[PDB]
Each structure stands twice: as C-alpha cells, then as structure tokens.
Ligand binder design. Structure first.
Ligand SMILES: CCCCCCCCCCCCCCCCCC(=O)OC[C@H](COP(=O)([O-])OCC(O)COP(=O)([O-])OC[C@@H](COC(=O)CCCCCCCCCCCCCCCCC)OC(=O)CCCCCCCCCCCCCCCCC)OC(=O)CCCCCCCCCCCCCCCCC
Ligand SMILES: CCCCCCCCCCCCCCCCCC(=O)OC[C@H](COP(=O)([O-])OCC(O)COP(=O)([O-])OC[C@@H](COC(=O)CCCCCCCCCCCCCCCCC)OC(=O)CCCCCCCCCCCCCCCCC)OC(=O)CCCCCCCCCCCCCCCCC
Ligand SMILES: CCCCCCCCCCCCCCCCCC(=O)OC[C@H](COP(=O)([O-])OCC(O)COP(=O)([O-])OC[C@@H](COC(=O)CCCCCCCCCCCCCCCCC)OC(=O)CCCCCCCCCCCCCCCCC)OC(=O)CCCCCCCCCCCCCCCCC
Ligand SMILES: CCCCCCCCCCCCCCCCCC(=O)OC[C@H](COP(=O)([O-])OCC(O)COP(=O)([O-])OC[C@@H](COC(=O)CCCCCCCCCCCCCCCCC)OC(=O)CCCCCCCCCCCCCCCCC)OC(=O)CCCCCCCCCCCCCCCCC
Ligand SMILES: CCCCCCCCCCCCCCCCCC(=O)OC[C@H](COP(=O)([O-])OCC(O)COP(=O)([O-])OC[C@@H](COC(=O)CCCCCCCCCCCCCCCCC)OC(=O)CCCCCCCCCCCCCCCCC)OC(=O)CCCCCCCCCCCCCCCCC
Ligand SMILES: CCCCCCCCCCCCCCCCCC(=O)OC[C@H](COP(=O)([O-])OCC[N+](C)(C)C)OC(=O)CCCCCCCCCCCCCCCCC
Ligand SMILES: CCCCCCCCCCCCCCCCCC(=O)OC[C@H](COP(=O)(O)OCCN)OC(=O)CCCCCCCCCCCCCCCCC
Lengths: 103, 218, 44, 110, 196, 88, 114, 74, 43
C-alpha cells in the first residue's frame, strides 16, 4: 500500500495490539480473566451429570452412585406431578371461592 | 360479512365520519381475508394431536393471536392518517418508528446499516483491503440492521395501544360532528361567559371537589 | 455433531483456518450454553 | 399469565346449560343473529351510532331467551337428558370415553 | 482462626495435589505441536491442565501461615509451590513459541489465500513488498530463536520441525527471482537443506 | 387445550340474566343502570369509595352499582319535588 | 363432549350474545352521557352567571353568591338523605349479604317516604 | 466417507469427581426448589384473578409531561 | 471401561436433540394460512 497509508496502518495496528495487551495483562483485569476462565472450565467440563465412567470394583462403589439416576428421576417426576396436583387444587379452590362470593 | 364499498354517510354534513366509513369499507375485504386465514390456521392447529396441536395450542401460537388482534383493530380503523400519529406522539414519541415496523406501509431500507457499511468501505479503501472483505463488511452491518429492525413484536403491542387510542378518538370526534349543530347556541352562550378552554368534565370535577370541601353541609 | 461442523468448515474454508483450537472451544462452550438456555426458556 | 382473566363466574351446571342452549339457538334463530351481526359490522352501526342496531339486537335476544326457556315437554326432557350426560362427562376425572353427541342431536331435533 | 485454617487447608490440598501432576501435564504439552499446545486437553482429556493453570497464580500470590504447617509438610508445600511456578514459566514459554508459530502460519495463510483456486477476485502475480518484509523479519526472528536454543537440543529440534515447516512452505510458494535470494538468505544456510 | 375449556373463555363475558326476562326487560335494566341524575355527582363520591371494599367479582359490581343507581334516582325525584324552582 | 362443529357454533352464538349486551350498554351509556354533558355545561354557565363561582384559566374560585349555587343544594340534600335513610353507610363492616340486606332495606325506606 | 453418528456420550465429559459420582442429587435439589418457587408464583398469579369493569377502573389520562391528555377536533 | 447409565445418556441426548429441533424448526406447528384459499367452508 501507499507508504503514508502504511504508516497510518502500522500505527493503528500497534495501537490495537497495545490496547488488547494492556487490558488483558492489567492487574485487576488479569485476575478477573484468570478467575473467570477457571469458573467457565468448571461449569463446562464438570456440570452435573447422570452418566460417568465407572472404574471401581462393585465393592468400591457407593450406593449413591448406583441409584443417583433413580433418585433424580424420582425428584423430577414427583415435582412435576405435585405441581400438576397443586394447579388442579388451586383451580378448584378459586372456582369455589368466587362461586360462593357471587353467582 | 361482505360490506359494500360505497359509504352511506352524507359527506356534506359529516365529512370526517364519511371519510372514515369509506376507508374502512375499502380495506375491509382484504383485512377480512387476512383475518379468516389467521382464524383458519388457529383452529386447524388446535385440531392437531398431542405435541402437533392441542397439547400446546393456546400457549405457543402467540404470534398468530397477536396478528389476529392487530388485524381486527386495523380493520375497524380502516386507514390511519399522519395527523393522528403526530397527535399520539405525545405519549409515545416513537409511534411512527413503531407503526412502520408493524404495518406494511413503506419499504424500510437499513440506512444506518448501509452508512456503517460505507464507513467500513472507506476504512478498507484507506488500508487497501481486498474487495471481498469490504463487500462482506458492507453486508454485515446491513444484516445486523435488518435483524434488529424486522420482527420486533413489541412494536405490534404499541401499535395495538395506538389503534385503541385512535378508535376512541375517532368515535368521540364523530359524536362531536353529529351534535355540532345542536350545541351551536349553547356553545355561543358558553364562550362568552367562560374565558377558559379547559374541558367541561375537568371543570365540573373541580367544582364538585370545591363544593365537597368548602360548601357547608348544613 | 458440532465437532463435525467445525471439521467441515476448517477443511473447506481457507479463512476459517485462522481460528485456534482454543477459539473453537470457546465457540463450543458458548453454543452449549445457548442451547441449554434455549431448551430451558422455550418451556417458560 | 397470558390467558385472559374471567369476568363472570359460571357454575359448571350453569356453564353447560348456557352452552347447550347456545348450540340450540344457533340453529333455531340463526336468522336474527345474522341480521344483528350485519347491522353491528359497520362503523356507524358498531361505534358511532349503535342505537340504530338496538331493535335488531332486541329481536335476537328475545329469540335466545325463548330458546333458554324450554317450553315443550319434549324439549325439556331432551335438554335434561343432555345436561345430565354433560355433567357426567365433565365430572369424570377418569379416562374419558363415549361422547354426548347422540343426546345433543336428539335435543336439536326437538 | 477458623477461616485461616480453611484457607490454608484448601491451598495445601490443591497445590500439593496438582504438584504430583505437573510432570504429566508439562510432558503432554511438550508432546503436541505449537499450533495448539493444549489441543489434547481441549479435545481428549483435561489431565488437570486447567487446574494447574488456575492454581499456579494462587501458589504464586496467596499467602501462607506456617504455624498451620508441619515441618515436612511445609517443606513439601514449598517444593510443590516451586513446581507450580516452574509450570507457570513453562506455560509462558510454550505460549510465546505458539504465538510465533501462528505468526508464521498467518503469513503462509495469506500466501495460500493468494494462490487459492477459488480466489477469482484477489489473484496477484507478483508478491507485494509488505508481505516480503514480513517474511524477512519473521525468518530473522526465527533464526535468532534457533540460536537462542543452542543449549537445549530437544527444544531446538522441536522448534525447527514445528515452526520452520511453514517457513519452508513459504519458501516453496514463490519463484526464485526478484528479491528471493535476499529474503531467504538466512533460511538458505541450514534450514532450507533440512526441508528437502 | 380442548374446546371444552376454551369455550369457557367465550362463556365468561356473558352476563347472567333470568331466563324468564324478555329482551325489553333486560334493556330496561341496562337503561336504569346507566341512568343519569345530577345528584349522582355527589352520591357517587360517597358510594363508589365504599363499594371498593366489597367488589371482587363482576356480579358484585353489577348489583351494588344498580342499587346505587336506584337510590340515586329516588333521591333525584325527591330533590326535584323539594326544589321545583331549579327545574322550571 | 360435543363435536368440534357444535363447539364452534356455540362460540359464534356466544360472541353474538356478548355483542348484543354490549350494544345495550353502548346505547344507554351514549344517551345518558349526552344528557350528563348538557346538564354539567348548563350548571357551570348558571354558576358563573349567578356569581356563585369565578372560573379563570384552569381554576374555579368561590364567589360571593356561593351559598346559592345549585350544586351546593344538591350536596346538602345528598348529605340529608344519607343521614335520614342510609344511616351507617360510611362504616358498615358487615358481610356482603348483610350489606345487600342493608341496601334493600334503605331502598324500601326511601320508597315509603317518597 | 466415514460413519460418525452415534448417541453414546463422549469420554471427555464422563469423568467423576474424586469423592464419587458427579454432583447430581445436589443440583437436582436446587432445580426442584427453583421450579417449585417459579411455578408457585405463576399459579398464584394466574388463578386468583378477575376482571372488574366499572367507572372506578378508569382514571384521567395524561401526557409524558404530566398534563391532561386532550386532542382538539382539528 | 464400563459407563454408568449409558442408555440413559443416549436417550437424554436423543430427547435433547429432538426438543431443540422441534422448537427451532417448529416442524410440528406448521402454518395453514397458505391453505385457506384451498379449503371449503361451513355454516
Ligand atoms: C436476507 C437476510 C440477510 C442476509 C445476509 C446476512 C449476512 C450475515 C453476515 C454474513 C457475514 C459473512 C462474512 C463473515 C464470514 C467469513 C468470511 C470470510 O471468510 O472472510 C474472508 C473471505 C474472503 O477471503 P479472500 O482471501 O478475500 O478470498 C480468497 C480465499 O481463497 C477465499 O477462501 P475461503 O474459502 O475462505 O473463501 C470462501 C468464502 C467465499 O468468498 C469467496 O472466496 C468468493 C465469494 C463470492 C462468490 C460469488 C459466486 C462465484 C461463482 C459461483 C457460481 C454462482 C452461480 C450463480 C448463478 C446460477 C445460475 C443457475 O466463503 C465465505 O465467504 C464464508 C461465508 C459465506 C456465507 C456467509 C455470507 C452470506 C452472504 C450472502 C449475501 C451476499 C450479498 C448479496 C449477493 C447477491 C446480490 C444479488 O470472505 C470475505 O471476505 C467475503 C465474505 C462474503 C461476501 C459475499 C459474497 C457472496 C456470497 C454468497 C453466498 C450465498 C450462499 C447461499 C445462501 C445465501 C442466503 C442469504
Ligand atoms: C428467504 C428464506 C431463505 C432460507 C434459506 C437461507 C439459507 C439458510 C442456511 C443455508 C446454509 C446452511 C449450512 C449448514 C451446513 C451444515 C454442515 C453440513 O453441510 O454438513 C456437513 C457434514 C457432513 O459430514 P460427513 O462426515 O461428510 O457425513 C458423511 C457420513 O457418512 C455421515 O455419517 P452417518 O451416515 O453415520 O450419519 C448418520 C446420520 C443420521 O441421520 C440420518 O441418517 C437421517 C436423519 C434424518 C432426520 C430427519 C429429521 C426430520 C425432522 C426435522 C425436519 C425439519 C425440516 C422439515 C420440516 C417440515 C417437514 C417435516 O447423521 C446425520 O444425518 C447427521 C446430521 C443430522 C443429524 C440429525 C439432527 C439434525 C438437526 C440438528 C439441529 C438443527 C438446528 C438448526 C437451527 C438453525 C438456527 C439458525 O455434516 C455435519 O456437519 C454434521 C453436523 C451438522 C450440524 C449442524 C447444526 C446446525 C448448525 C446451525 C448453524 C449453521 C451456520 C451456517 C452458516 C450461516 C451463514 C454464515
Ligand atoms: C450478578 C450475579 C453475580 C454472581 C454470579 C456470577 C456468575 C458468573 C461467574 C463470575 C465469574 C467471575 C467473577 C469475577 C472475578 C473476581 C476476581 C477476584 O476475586 O479478584 C481478586 C483478585 C485478587 O486476588 P488474587 O490476586 O487472586 O490473590 C492474591 C491477593 O493478594 C489476595 O491474597 P489473599 O490470600 O490475601 O486473599 C485471597 C482471597 C481471600 O482469602 C481468604 O480470606 C479466604 C477465602 C476463601 C478460601 C477458600 C476456603 C474454602 C473453605 C471451604 C468452604 C466450604 C463451603 C461449603 C461447601 C462444603 C462442601 C464442598 O481473596 C481472593 O482472591 C478472593 C477471590 C474469590 C474467592 C476465591 C475462593 C474460592 C473458594 C471459596 C468460595 C466458593 C465456595 C467453594 C466451596 C467448596 C470448596 C471445596 O483480583 C482483584 O483484586 C480484582 C479486583 C477487581 C475485580 C472485582 C473483584 C470482586 C471481588 C469479589 C469477592 C468475592 C469474595 C467471595 C464472596 C462469597 C460470598 C458467598
Ligand atoms: C445457586 C445460586 C447461587 C449461584 C452463585 C454462583 C456464583 C459463581 C461465582 C464464580 C466466581 C469465580 C469462581 C472461581 C473459582 C473459585 C472456586 C474454585 O476454584 O473451585 C473450588 C471448588 C473445588 O474446585 P477444585 O478443587 O478445582 O475441583 C475441580 C478439580 O477438577 C478437582 O476435581 P475433584 O475430582 O478433586 O473433585 C472436586 C470437586 C469438589 O466440588 C465440591 O465440593 C463442590 C460440590 C457442589 C457444592 C457442594 C456444597 C453444597 C452446599 C453449599 C451451601 C452454600 C451456602 C451459602 C450460604 C451463603 C449465605 C450468605 O469439584 C467439583 O466437582 C466441581 C463442581 C463444579 C460444579 C459446576 C456447576 C456448573 C453448572 C451450574 C449451573 C447449573 C444450572 C442447571 C439448570 C438446568 C435446568 C434444566 O469448586 C467450586 O467451588 C465449584 C464452583 C462451581 C460453580 C462456579 C460457577 C457458577 C456459574 C453459574 C452460572 C451463572 C451464569 C450467570 C450469567 C453470567 C453473568 C453473571
Ligand atoms: C463468567 C463465567 C463464564 C461465562 C462464560 C460464557 C458462557 C456462560 C457459562 C455459564 C456457566 C454455566 C453454563 C451452563 C452449563 C453448560 C453445560 C455444558 O455445556 O455441558 C455440556 C456437556 C455435554 O456432554 P456430552 O458428553 O455431550 O453429554 C451430554 C448428554 O446430554 C448426556 O447427558 P446426561 O445423560 O448426563 O444427562 C444430564 C442430566 C443433567 O440433569 C441433572 O441432573 C440436573 C437436574 C436439574 C438441576 C437444575 C439446578 C438449577 C439450580 C438453579 C439455582 C438458581 C440459580 C440462580 C443464579 C442467579 C445468579 C447468581 O440430565 C438429567 O438428569 C435427566 C433428567 C430427566 C428427567 C426425566 C423426568 C421423568 C419423569 C417421569 C418419571 C417416571 C414416571 C413413570 C410413569 C410410568 C407410567 C406407566 O453436558 C454434560 O455432560 C452435562 C449434562 C448437561 C447439563 C446442562 C446444564 C445446563 C444449564 C444451563 C443454565 C443456564 C442458566 C442461565 C441463568 C441466567 C440468569 C440471568
Ligand atoms: C443471496 C446470495 C446467493 C448467491 C448464491 C451463490 C452460490 C455460490 C455457490 C458456490 C459453490 C461452491 C464453489 C465456490 C466456493 C468454494 C469454496 C471452497 O472451499 O472451495 C475452495 C476450493 C478451491 O481451492 P483449492 O482447490 O486451491 O483448495 C485449497 C488448497 N490450498 C489450501 C492448498 C490452497 O474449491 C473451489 O473453489 C472449487 C471451485 C469450483 C468452481 C466450479 C464452477 C462451476 C460453474 C458452473 C456454471 C454452470 C452454468 C450453466 C449455464 C447454463 C445455460 C443454459
Ligand atoms: C462458513 C460458515 C461457518 C459457520 C460456523 C457456525 C458454527 C456453529 C456452532 C454451534 C452450533 C452447533 C449446533 C449443533 C446442533 C444442536 C445439537 C443439540 O441440540 O445438542 C447440543 C449438545 C449435544 O450435541 P453435540 O455436543 O453436538 O453432540 C454430542 C454427542 N455425544 O447439547 C448440549 O451439550 C447442551 C446441554 C444440554 C444437553 C442435553 C441434556 C440432557 C437432556 C435432558 C435435561 C433434563 C433437565 C431437567 C429436566 C427437564 C425436563 C423435566
């Protein structure tokens, strides 16, 4: 490119590089990035799960790790069914209340 | 209903009431076809089975219901003139910017996006980038502008609010025109006694409060 | 699946070669988060 | 919540009674309903000067009332049978089965 | 000091536990190439890699409370802390080399996009001066790096095999005319003969 | 959502009237509800504020406001008898 | 319960019935609103002319002839009726049915004396 | 071409924690509690509603400037 | 080698894919406004 535009472009890219480097390596910003990276890693690679590799002999595996799936299913299904029953009960209660109040 | 296009109002005595009726009848057939299509879609979807239908009919077919309400209100209004939009600008300064994104009034060009694209083009021209890069950087801001412009169903809610306001205003205006001759004499007497332009309802509410406060119960 | 899409884009698009495995992983994490958010929100 | 709120609380019995009477009325007095809807469609007839529709409205209402008041003994018997079937269907929280269409057809032919 | 007890126990547990793994992680990082040194950890198995990267800073910075430490325990903690600091420096070095590799690969990618068959819109017969200067300076820095690694034959060999690959491809991308003798003067000494 | 439930959303907005009332009686009831009397401007102030303590459903509102209108109409007739001068 | 066709028939009929009731409401309300506006305008004119009040800008001020204003008489008679017949209305902390009974008895008392 | 489709989980995410299986019950408890709270609020708002339409439900309109809204018959 | 609850994992992944595709494409919840001109009428 034209050498004047070359000077402008070199200056601009140098400014961009310096800004990025400063923002990343500044003390507080560096600490924030460093902690957030590990938090993101924990969230992504250690999220709650129901399937995992079993490397232990049956004698060396807890019962929790053989019935965790069933406990989770019980909890979720019970929550859904109980919410459904609560919805029905609230429907009946509201209907009865507003009926006895008028018409 | 297949309403005729020829209004039965007298233009000489109720001009605005005649124009409103004429526009309503003119656009009624088209808006009725759209409303029928929407209702047919809704009921046929509700006839579905399990996930394809009933199990999720009322809650997930929301855009269709919103379109149906907008179509019904617009059919009742018929046509909208800029004077009313500017009138409602009091409570919603972006009424035109919202009423453009709800109705197919005029074609919208992403002018801000194209301007940003031209700026990026100037930048690339200065820094001697390949033409493919600058064409892509022209498309990209345009794409962003289009994405942020279209859709925007909140503008439809604001259009519904404005159309309700406009319908109430037009009804009241028609009532004003219909009884204008009857109130000519009373109006002439009133203007000479009250120098205020404030409404009769507001003044009477203030008078009622004044009586309730100061007047001796006796 | 995601891996396959990234592989195709890398093998066919010369420009896409610019991205590191780290940037690809960041896109993977963001896409998984967005997918989880989409699944959760649609039912709300 | 997005579902609209209710205005008038109808008992289940009242709801079924009104629903069945409405289905009967749409057959007995569709002419009055159509005339009323036609007169209430225009701008002048709907918002500006609704009183021009008043007479038509009255007629329609009268017809509906006449349907709501089952005069013939056969009409009363058929309506009671259909209403009882509807109540049984509604109260059946267990898996629902046969429909009440036969009783409704019997009532609409009375 | 209950909070002090918990802080020190957490630090001890994490630091000592990871110190037993630093060897494995560093070896794996050495094993891969410089394009994505953490490729194995991102794709195959994160063998306490992100843990090391996170806890190196804590080992460097977070304070210690010796009264909560034993004698042998304190010696072990100091050893583990030194190992984590070594890992920090090793990761910094690998990152620097990896970024230099990506500089060279960026130059090569520009050339490849130049000579791509789909490039019907930006086809250039003659290399422009800017990329020539970039190539010359990049090769100069690469030669200086090779010289600086004379005490580490394995590191020098890896740097050659990895980074100089794209220098060789750049060499092959262009004809031997114009300024070519001057641009690849340093490369022609030893590296060019290696990549034949 | 089956039609048996949706139809409830079209049955709710219908006011409940005795089946033995002719349309004219219903319209007369509406007229009485919407009747106007000057004294209202004051009695309403003392009525509505009270009814807010009891209204929870539309039927309550209908009944209470209709009784208020009946009382106000009777009061208007009594006042007109009392003060003929203002009404001649 | 019933075929979908009958359900839609019912829906259409109910929409029509609701529209009819709204028609009744609209007719009555429009008529009485016109009457109300006429009465209020006439009352303001009489008040200003009689000297009862002075209306300037957006404010109503008490005149020298305030005691003669018709609205004052209306307010006083409203108080009189709320005392003589509808006593205890202001604070009646009873059940809704009790309140309905109270209103009905007050209506009967007013009717008898009228 | 090579076949690659499969429903099996990837070994990269199949690791356990040191003390046992992944934190499944602990997170499910939180999820159930949050769902309970959210659905309870939604149900309470939805079911206990009525529409009361009378004169007291209407108030005087005003501009964003606070003044009373009145539009001329221009 | 053994994977605890592998079948559960397979079915969960399949369900997630199915639900995401269902909501993204709305395959099951089509639009019939285009068919209205090609439909008969009642009443
Ligand atoms: C309506 C809603 C809104 C719609 C628009 C939404 C836009 C959202 C934002 C999009 C942002 C795109 C840019 C970022 C992505 C990465 C780009 C990149 O690599 O940057 C560097 C790279 C340039 O690299 P380079 O070094 O300059 O090139 C040499 C390398 O060797 C090259 O090596 P390489 O392999 O890397 O290069 C391949 C390169 C492709 O670039 C190329 O090398 C060539 C591009 C031009 C090809 C033109 C056709 C050539 C002839 C083929 C035969 C056609 C026959 C047609 C007639 C048939 C008759 C029967 O591939 C890409 O660009 C990747 C992404 C492509 C898809 C996304 C962009 C879609 C844009 C669609 C609209 C375009 C404008 C309107 C056009 C129509 C007007 C009427 O790309 C660019 O800078 C250009 C970007 C694309 C510009 C538009 C070109 C036309 C594309 C049309 C595609 C149509 C697909 C069908 C569906 C369309 C639905 C809308
Ligand atoms: C004005 C309007 C304009 C409209 C149009 C505008 C333009 C629109 C965009 C156009 C461009 C799109 C480009 C997409 C490229 C995808 C990659 C590709 O081509 O595949 C190569 C590559 C080929 O691999 P290969 O190794 O060569 O395959 C040979 C093997 O032998 C094969 O191995 P195998 O035989 O063992 O495999 C067995 C087979 C097993 O399957 C079968 O054998 C048959 C399965 C049949 C499934 C039937 C499903 C039916 C229900 C759904 C139907 C919906 C549509 C119809 C609805 C109405 C009618 C029912 O596996 C597969 O078939 C694998 C793929 C299918 C998996 C099933 C799930 C697919 C859907 C995933 C979710 C999609 C969400 C979209 C959200 C979009 C948001 C914007 O395939 C992949 O990459 C696989 C993974 C692809 C994942 C894509 C996920 C979605 C990505 C969204 C973002 C994309 C952004 C693109 C750039 C945008 C502009 C900058
Ligand atoms: C809107 C929603 C918001 C919430 C949701 C957010 C969701 C998205 C994710 C966000 C991710 C990014 C977050 C922002 C980045 C923060 C960066 C940062 O902290 O900068 C510090 C960093 C300086 O620290 P450094 O350079 O790393 O360390 C050297 C220093 O000289 C200092 O040396 P030193 O030794 O004097 O002091 C070291 C220590 C202060 O030292 C102490 O006093 C001790 C601290 C605790 C140590 C761990 C004890 C654990 C004991 C067991 C607990 C068990 C609990 C029950 C469970 C049991 C069963 C498992 O100070 C720190 O460095 C604090 C860092 C943050 C906490 C680190 C501890 C993590 C573990 C404990 C909490 C998590 C629970 C784990 C439970 C399971 C454990 C197995 O850089 C800055 O100064 C930047 C300042 C400007 C940025 C913003 C600063 C925000 C400050 C927030 C403080 C929060 C404190 C904890 C509150 C807990 C409430 C319950
Ligand atoms: C809930 C409401 C409040 C939420 C607040 C969230 C606040 C987050 C702030 C984060 C700040 C930066 C943290 C830096 C790291 C410092 C701690 C550390 O290094 O780890 C110490 C400790 C041990 O780490 P390590 O020794 O390195 O172990 C890993 C090694 O590989 C060694 O592994 P190992 O084999 O030796 O085993 C060691 C084991 C040891 O781990 C444990 O012992 C922890 C086990 C769990 C907790 C046990 C205690 C439970 C009781 C706590 C009671 C607290 C009461 C507090 C009262 C306060 C009163 C004021 O480690 C693990 O297993 C790690 C578990 C990681 C779990 C990650 C969860 C991801 C998903 C989260 C969202 C799920 C949504 C599902 C929705 C689905 C709907 C369908 O780990 C943790 O503290 C785990 C924290 C995980 C969560 C952090 C990020 C949460 C972000 C949530 C999403 C928010 C997005 C919002 C939008 C974005 C903008 C706002
Ligand atoms: C600044 C920080 C950094 C920011 C970076 C930028 C990005 C943001 C990062 C933020 C960090 C979190 C990101 C989200 C997590 C990402 C996880 C991931 O990518 O993992 C990939 C990774 C992929 O691995 P893979 O190898 O592909 O395998 C995946 C397969 O699906 C294999 O899956 P699987 O087989 O292992 O299954 C997984 C498991 C996971 O599920 C669980 O265990 C979890 C359960 C739910 C827990 C929810 C806890 C939520 C707590 C919230 C508390 C409040 C927070 C408030 C915070 C406020 C701020 C402080 O599923 C189940 O448990 C299945 C349950 C099925 C129940 C079926 C019910 C049956 C009922 C009937 C019963 C029987 C009746 C019989 C009747 C018979 C009649 C005849 O996923 C996993 O392996 C983990 C499983 C998936 C977890 C997804 C979690 C999503 C959470 C999204 C939260 C969004 C919150 C937004 C808040 C905004 C606030 C403003
Ligand atoms: C709204 C906008 C819509 C626009 C639609 C545009 C459609 C574009 C379709 C493009 C198809 C694919 C080719 C271009 C993109 C290639 C990308 C890629 O990765 O390729 C790189 C490679 C090329 O690069 P390469 O081969 O050098 O590979 C890279 C190698 N290194 C890294 C070493 C450099 O493939 C190609 O580009 C192949 C191009 C083939 C071109 C074929 C043209 C056929 C024309 C037929 C015309 C028929 C007319 C009939 C008229 C009849 C009249 C009666
Ligand atoms: C030139 C152009 C270039 C263009 C480049 C564009 C690149 C775009 C890249 C990003 C987009 C990729 C999209 C891929 C398709 C979507 C697939 C999907 O929905 O799943 C995503 C992911 C699992 O899919 P994937 O990781 O790809 O395959 C794993 C195989 N074992 O799923 C996840 O991991 C998400 C997390 C949840 C997974 C499911 C969890 C189990 C399901 C049950 C949860 C129960 C919760 C509690 C109970 C609720 C119900 C009661």
């Amino acid at each position: 490119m034209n050498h004047s535009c070359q000077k402008v472009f070199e200056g601009f890219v140098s400014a961009l590089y310096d800004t990025s480097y400063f923002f990343r390596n500044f003390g507080p910003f560096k600490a924030t990035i460093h902690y957030a990276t590990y938090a993101n890693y924990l969230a992504q690679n250690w999220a709650p799960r129901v399937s995992y590799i079993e490397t232990s002999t049956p004698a060396y595996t807890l019962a929790k790790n053989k019935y965790a799936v069933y406990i989770v299913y019980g909890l979720i299904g019970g929550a859904l069914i109980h919410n459904y029953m609560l919805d029905n009960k609230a429907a009946q209660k509201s209907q009865q209340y507003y009926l006895k109040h008028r018409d | 209903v297949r309403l005729n296009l020829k209004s039965n109002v007298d233009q000489n005595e109720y001009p605005f009431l005649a124009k409103w009726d004429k526009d309503m009848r003119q656009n009624y057939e088209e808006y009725q076809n759209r409303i029928d299509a929407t209702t047919y879609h809704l009921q046929r979807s509700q006839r579905g089975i399990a996930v394809f239908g009933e199990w999720m009919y009322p809650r997930y077919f929301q855009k269709d219901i919103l379109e149906l309400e907008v179509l019904r209100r617009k059919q009742q209004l018929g046509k909208i003139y800029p004077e009313e939009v500017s009138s409602y600008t009091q409570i919603n300064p972006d009424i035109a910017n919202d009423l453009n994104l709800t109705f197919n009034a005029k074609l919208l060009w992403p002018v801000r996006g194209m301007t940003v694209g031209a700026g990026f083009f100037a930048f690339a021209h200065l820094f001697n980038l390949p033409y493919s890069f600058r064409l892509g950087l022209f498309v990209l801001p345009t794409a962003v502008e289009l994405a942020f412009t279209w859709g925007n169903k909140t503008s439809q809610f604001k259009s519904i609010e404005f159309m309700d306001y406009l319908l109430q205003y037009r009804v009241s205006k028609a009532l004003l025109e219909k009884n204008a001759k009857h109130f000519a004499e009373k109006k002439a007497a009133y203007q000479k006694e009250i120098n205020s332009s404030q409404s009769v309802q507001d003044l009477y509410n203030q008078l009622i409060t004044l009586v309730s406060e100061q007047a001796p119960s006796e | 699946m995601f891996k396959e899409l990234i592989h195709i884009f890398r093998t066919y698009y010369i420009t896409f070669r610019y991205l590191k495995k780290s940037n690809i992983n960041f896109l993977k994490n963001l896409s998984y988060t967005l997918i989880a958010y989409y699944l959760i929100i649609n039912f709300q | 919540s997005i579902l609209p709120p209710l205005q008038y609380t109808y008992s289940n019995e009242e709801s079924l009674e009104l629903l069945i009477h409405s289905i009967k009325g749409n057959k007995d007095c569709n002419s009055e309903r159509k005339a009323f809807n036609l007169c209430r469609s225009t701008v002048l007839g709907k918002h500006v000067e609704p009183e021009k529709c008043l007479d038509k409205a009255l007629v329609f209402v009268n017809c509906f009332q006449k349907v709501r008041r089952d005069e013939s003994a056969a009409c009363q018997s058929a309506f009671n049978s259909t209403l009882e079937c509807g109540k049984k269907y509604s109260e059946s929280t267990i898996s629902l089965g046969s429909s009440c269409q036969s009783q409704l057809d019997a009532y609409l032919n009375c | 000091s209950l909070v002090s007890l918990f802080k020190n126990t957490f630090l001890k547990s994490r630091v000592i536990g990871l110190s037993f793994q630093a060897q494995r992680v560093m070896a794996q990082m050495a094993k891969t190439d410089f394009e994505n040194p953490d490729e194995h950890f991102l794709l195959n198995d994160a063998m306490k890699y992100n843990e090391l990267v996170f806890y190196g800073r804590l080992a460097e910075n977070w304070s210690i409370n010796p009264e909560l430490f034993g004698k042998a325990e304190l010696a072990k903690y100091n050893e583990a802390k030194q190992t984590l600091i070594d890992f920090n420096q090793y990761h910094a070095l690998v990152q620097n080399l990896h970024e230099f590799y990506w500089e060279l690969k960026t130059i090569y990618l520009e050339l490849s996009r130049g000579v791509a068959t789909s490039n019907f819109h930006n086809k250039r017969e003659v290399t422009h001066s800017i990329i020539e200067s970039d190539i010359k300076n990049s090769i100069h820095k690469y030669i200086q790096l090779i010289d600086d690694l004379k005490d580490y034959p394995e590191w020098q060999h890896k740097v050659r095999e990895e980074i100089g690959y794209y220098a060789h491809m750049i060499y092959t991308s262009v004809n031997h005319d114009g300024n070519f003798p001057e641009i690849f003067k340093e490369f022609n000494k030893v590296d060019s003969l290696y990549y034949f | 959502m089956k039609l048996d439930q949706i139809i409830s959303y079209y049955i709710t907005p219908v006011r409940r009237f005795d089946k033995n009332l002719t349309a004219e009686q219903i319209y007369e009831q509406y007229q009485q509800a919407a009747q106007f009397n000057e004294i209202d401007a004051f009695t309403n102030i003392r009525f509505h504020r009270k009814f807010k303590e009891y209204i929870q459903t539309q039927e309550q509102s209908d009944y209470l406001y209709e009784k208020a209108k009946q009382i106000s109409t009777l009061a208007q007739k009594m006042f007109e008898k009392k003060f003929p001068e203002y009404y001649t | 319960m019933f075929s979908d066709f009958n359900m839609y028939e019912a829906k259409v009929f109910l929409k029509a019935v609701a529209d009819a009731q709204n028609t009744f409401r609209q007719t009555a309300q429009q008529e009485n609103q016109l009457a109300r506006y006429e009465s209020q305008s006439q009352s303001l004119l009489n008040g200003s002319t009689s000297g009862a009040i002075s209306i300037t800008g957006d404010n109503i001020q008490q005149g020298r002839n305030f005691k003669a204003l018709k609205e004052v008489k209306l307010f006083q008679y409203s108080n009189e009726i709320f005392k003589k017949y509808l006593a205890g209305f202001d604070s009646f902390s009873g059940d809704y049915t009790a309140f309905k009974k109270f209103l009905n008895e007050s209506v009967k008392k007013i009717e008898q004396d009228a | 071409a090579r076949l690659w489709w499969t429903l099996d989980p990837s070994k990269y995410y199949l690791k356990q924690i040191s003390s046992g299986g992944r934190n499944e019950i602990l997170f499910t408890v939180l999820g159930v509690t949050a769902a309970y709270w959210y659905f309870g609020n939604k149900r309470c708002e939805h079911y206990w509603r009525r529409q009361i339409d009378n004169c007291q439900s209407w108030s005087r309109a005003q501009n964003i400037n606070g003044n009373n809204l009145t539009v001329k018959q221009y | 080698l053994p994977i605890r609850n592998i079948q559960f994992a397979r079915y969960h992944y399949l369900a997630a894919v199915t639900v995401f595709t269902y909501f993204a494409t709305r395959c099951c919840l089509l639009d019939y406004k285009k068919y209205y001109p090609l439909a008969s009428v009642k009443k």
